[PDB]
Amino acid sequence: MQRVTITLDDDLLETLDSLSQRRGYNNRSEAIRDILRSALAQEGTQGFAVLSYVYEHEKRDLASRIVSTQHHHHDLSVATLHVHINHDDCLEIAVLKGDMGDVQHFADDVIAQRGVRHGHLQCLPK
Amino acid sequence: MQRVTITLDDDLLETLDSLSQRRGYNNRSEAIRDILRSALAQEATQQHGTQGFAVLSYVYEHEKRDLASRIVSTQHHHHDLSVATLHVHINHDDCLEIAVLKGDMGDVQHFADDVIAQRGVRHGHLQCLPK
Amino acid sequence: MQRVTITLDDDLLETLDSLSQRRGYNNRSEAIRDILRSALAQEGTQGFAVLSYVYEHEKRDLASRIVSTQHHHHDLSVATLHVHINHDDCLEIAVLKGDMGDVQHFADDVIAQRGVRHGHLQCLPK
Amino acid sequence: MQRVTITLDDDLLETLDSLSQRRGYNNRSEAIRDILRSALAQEATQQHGTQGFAVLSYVYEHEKRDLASRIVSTQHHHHDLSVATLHVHINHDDCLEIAVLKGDMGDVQHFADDVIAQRGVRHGHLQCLPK
Ligand SMILES: OC[C@H]1O[C@H](O[C@H]2[C@H](O)[C@@H](O)[C@H](OCCCC3CCCCC3)O[C@@H]2CO)[C@H](O)[C@@H](O)[C@@H]1O
Numbered sequence A, C: 001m002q003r004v005t006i007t008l009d010d011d012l013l014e015t016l017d018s019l020s021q022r023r024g025y026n027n028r029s030e031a032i033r034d035i036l037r038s039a040l041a042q043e044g045t046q047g048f049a050v051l052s053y054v055y056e057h058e059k060r061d062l063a064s065r066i067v068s069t070q071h072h073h074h075d076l077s078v079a080t081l082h083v084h085i086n087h088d089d090c091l092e093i094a095v096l097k098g099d100m101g102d103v104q105h106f107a108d109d110v111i112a113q114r115g116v117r118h119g120h121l122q123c124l125p126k
Numbered sequence B, D: 001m002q003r004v005t006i007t008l009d010d011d012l013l014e015t016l017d018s019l020s021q022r023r024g025y026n027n028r029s030e031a032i033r034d035i036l037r038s039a040l041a042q043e044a045t046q047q048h049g050t051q052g053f054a055v056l057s058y059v060y061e062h063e064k065r066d067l068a069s070r071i072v073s074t075q076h077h078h079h080d081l082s083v084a085t086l087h088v089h090i091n092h093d094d095c096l097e098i099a100v101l102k103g104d105m106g107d108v109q110h111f112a113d114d115v116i117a118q119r120g121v122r123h124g125h126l127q128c129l130p131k
């Protein structure tokens, strides 16, 4: 086997070590090795996708802007689930379909802007 | 068992007649009774004092009054009544929304109307599901 | 104008009269006349539709049966919203699309059976 | 600031290497650091003691173990954690489900795993949104 040495900051190490004692790992090396294993494990043209994001609806009238943006590409949209989590925040999940290339750009149009948080895209190609 | 006499204008009776025949009704009393039972049934479904769920669906033009924002702002105004909302972008202009609500059937009802009323919003429909 | 006389049962009349005094209608005739007005007021090949229904998921494994039924016609299905209202009951709203004729039959396949309650179909033709 | 030495097997290092280059990483430490930050970030997101919402998505074959029924039965088993579920019939065989959850992030997390684990269920993914 081989060895790779990396420099890690204190807080990150405090969090890694926290999970180390608990999770029952001998040390940092073993924990990191497992995390890498899963990360790498978790890695077509047509398919589906799930886009989730959080945003304040009033902010910049963002709600209106996101809906029109989606309507500009409604052909790629199957449907959206919306949950009014609090007085100002909205949680939306858009199920998208079509060309993975166009879906990915459509995703950038929606979440790559101010007022949108926790944006995540999950692709599911056929 | 009571015979109730109803006074109807010509235009209205012709409508009741035409619509009735297309739908297979051969006489007016049966037709009127079905409408009445249906309608009274829904009203009783929308009464204060009882908890439950409801389904509110409607079609709206998102560009309108920035109707998109107002419909959401209003939902947030009463977010204690909202479970979740499914939205389908019909075409470039229209949005199909289905809001699932919970709480007091009467309050839900009053809320639905405030929504279905707004201009730009068409095909509105409420279905209360009392506990 | 004209007059039509109808026979109505006691309970129904008790409910109509209840709404009469409250709603501020002079009498049965005026209330019925308004109800008819709305009913009649509220009345294409391609379009959308909203199907809602309630059912006990465990009952006859109904949940499994409804999903396959929908999958048999998945081409007509856009998406379904599901809310687990209690321990045994489920509330589902299926947004359907396609030929109104096929949508209507597809609706019968889903809600016209035992264990399904409050089934309602709303058509929205283009 | 601490230098941490990690011991990796040949196969694993080759994978890290290949995947890294395709994704534009020119060296191993940066790649490993990004993975670590990302991963630790999610874990901290799934901790008991904090309330919030979550999005759980997965694809499953409805015919399977009558998986359809078990997935729903299980959801009902913890329906206090469930807000609502969007379901999309991908094709004749597969179902895309997106369940929105609320409650204690740790409990939600444990629930998600119980679901993502089941056989027949693929592409599972959890995203916790702590209050
Ligand atoms: O719970 C029983 C039924 O309740 C609702 O049906 C409604 C129906 O959607 C409505 O259209 C009809 O109205 C009948 C009015 C008939 C008029 C008379 C002549 C002119 C035009 C129609 O009432 C029934 C209720 O019984 C549901 O849509 C249906 O799926 C369910 O099985």
Ligand SMILES: OC[C@H]1O[C@H](O[C@H]2[C@H](O)[C@@H](O)[C@H](OCCCC3CCCCC3)O[C@@H]2CO)[C@H](O)[C@@H](O)[C@@H]1O
Pocket (backbone or CB within 6 Å): A043, A118, A119, A120, A121, D016, D019, D020, D023, D025, D031, D032, D034, D035, D038
């Ligand atoms: O909150 C910041 C970001 O958080 C998530 O991004 C993730 C991304 O989805 C994941 O793929 C990446 O992993 C990087 C791991 C890179 C590996 C190194 C070499 C081998 C293959 C990948 O981390 C970022 C977080 O910073 C969201 O998906 C993204 O929309 C958001 O803007």
Ligand code: NI
Pocket (backbone or CB within 6 Å): A057, A082, A083, A084, A085, A089, A090, A091, B072, B076
């Ligand atoms: Ni909202």
Ligand code: NI
Pocket (backbone or CB within 6 Å): A067, A071, B062, B087, B088, B089, B090, B094, B095, B096
């Ligand atoms: Ni829309």
Ligand code: NI
Pocket (backbone or CB within 6 Å): C057, C082, C083, C084, C085, C089, C090, C091, D072, D076
């Ligand atoms: Ni359910």
Ligand code: NI
Pocket (backbone or CB within 6 Å): C067, C071, D062, D087, D088, D089, D090, D094, D095, D096
């Ligand atoms: Ni399905």
